[PDB]
Design a protein around this ligand. Structure first.
Ligand SMILES: CCCCO[C@H]1O[C@H](CO)[C@@H](O)[C@H](O)[C@@H]1O
Length: 158
């Protein structure tokens, strides 16, 4: 079991940590959602799917910078929505193919009020999302840590 991002960065068998830089809506009014769709950025596969089933969870989803201070909302994982920042481990998704498949995680965030200008700075840490992978085979329990950075400024206007 291993992962990679849309920019080609791999996290190998056994886990590790990678930086993901996300493009964001440049202007988000009060009353609008900012969506951070990591399902278009992070992909994984099962290396031996004929004999092993891999189980994958969002173990923890943490908010930083302007996302922690200027926004509020939820995380959708697979077919269900949860508080973000997270207060629990999600249920398991099955990976059962060697073709990379999306990690089905998206943040749906809304402005808590206008910041007066820049609500998320370009290059700032906005989230840390921990993917936990186990299986039905041995006692592997690996963490793939995704540090999410804003690629551009997000303004919540007055
Ligand atoms: C004998 C299995 C060696 C490869 O083990 C790896 O591949 C399998 C299948 O993806 C995973 O379940 C496991 O955690 C490792 O990432």
């Amino acid at each position: 079991f291993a992962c990679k991002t849309a920019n080609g960065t791999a996290i190998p068998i056994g886990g590790g940590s990678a930086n993901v830089y996300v493009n964001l809506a440049p202007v988000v009014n009060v009353g609008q959602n900012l969506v951070v769709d990591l399902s278009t950025q992070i992909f994984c596969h099962n290396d031996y799917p004929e004999t092993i089933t891999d189980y994958v969870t969002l173990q923890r989803g943490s908010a930083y910078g302007g996302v922690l201070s200027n926004f509020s909302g939820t995380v959708k994982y697979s077919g269900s929505s949860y508080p973000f920042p997270t207060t629990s481990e999600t249920p398991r998704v099955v990976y059962n193919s060697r073709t990379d498949k999306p990690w089905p995680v998206a943040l749906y965030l809304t402005p808590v009020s206008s910041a007066g200008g820049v609500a998320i700075k370009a290059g700032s840490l906005i989230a840390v999302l921990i993917l936990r992978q186990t299986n039905n085979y041995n006692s592997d329990d690996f963490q793939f840590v995704w540090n999410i950075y804003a690629n551009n400024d997000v303004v919540v206007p007055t």
